[PDB]
Amino acid sequence: SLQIDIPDALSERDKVKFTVHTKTTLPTFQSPEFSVTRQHEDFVWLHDTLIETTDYAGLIIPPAPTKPDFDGPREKMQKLGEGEGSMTKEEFAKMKQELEAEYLAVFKKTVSSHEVFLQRLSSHPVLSKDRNFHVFLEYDQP
Amino acid sequence: PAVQFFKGKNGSADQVILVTQ
């Protein structure tokens, strides 16, 4: 019994951080419930790692999550900071709301992609047990 | 320019929060 979700993520300029949260009945895990923080870059590492694992040949590895694109929204919010004095106050609020909804739309799609990939892994009978996958799930030494 | 995402508690709608950077 492995259940995985991403409750929250942060988009911050340089990177995107995903909180990957796990509930398990598996004994092999030290704890039943935990969370660790993973970058997109990490999921790709896992996927890369799985794909090249020899035992797992003749298994189909779930597709990796696509890289998050916050660029459009990011540029606008960077400008918006730019316009705080100058802009009519109302415009700024509407502009703030719209930019946020835009960031939000991206998050939803991207969170799903990353979440689905992990959930797809947990579902798999063989893959669910992979060591590299386990560390990704639980190694929370910051 | 850092944006924080919270998944909605079911069936709670999802959110984004500005952060300070």
Author numbering:
A (entry chain A): 30 to 171
B (entry chain B): 112 to 132
Article excerpt on this structure:
From the initial stages of invasion until eventual bacterial egress the chlamydial inclusion is extensively modified by insertion of numerous Type-III secreted bacterial effector proteins called inclusion membrane proteins or ‘Incs’. Specifically it was shown that the C. trachomatis IncE/CT116 protein could recruit SNX proteins containing bin-amphiphysin-Rvs (BAR) domains SNX1, SNX2, SNX5 and SNX6. SNX recruitment to the inclusion occurs via the C-terminal region of IncE interacting with the phox-homology (PX) domains of SNX5 or SNX6. In this study, we present the first reported crystal structure of a chlamydial inclusion protein (IncE) binding to its host effector protein (SNX5).
When bound to SNX5, IncE adopts an elongated β-hairpin structure, with key hydrophobic residues docked into a complementary binding groove encompassing a helix-turn-helix structural extension that is unique to SNX5, SNX6, and the brain-specific homologue SNX32. Confirming that the fusion does not alter complex formation, the short linker region is disordered, and the mode of IncE-binding to SNX5 is identical in all three structures. The β-hairpin structure of IncE (N-terminal βA and C-terminal βB strands) is directly incorporated as a β-sheet augmentation of the β1, β2 and β3 strands of SNX5. The N-terminal βA strand of the IncE sequence (Gly111-Lys118) forms the primary interface with SNX5, making main-chain hydrogen bonds with the β1 strand of the SNX5 PX domain for the stable positioning of the IncE structure. The two anti-parallel β-strands of IncE are connected by a short loop (Gly119-Ala124) that makes no direct contact with the SNX5 protein, and the C-terminal IncE βB strand (Asp125-Val130) forms an interface with the extended α-helical region of the SNX5 PX domain.Video 2. A major contribution comes from IncE Phe116, with π-stacking occurring with the Phe136 side-chain and hydrophobic docking with Val140 of SNX5. The reciprocal mutations in IncE residues F116A and V127D also abolished binding to the SNX5 PX domain, and the SNX6 and SNX32 PX domains, demonstrating the importance of these hydrophobic and π-stacking interactions for stable complex formation. In essence the IncE β-hairpin acts as a tether between the core PX fold and extended α-helical hairpin, pulling the two sub-structures closer together.
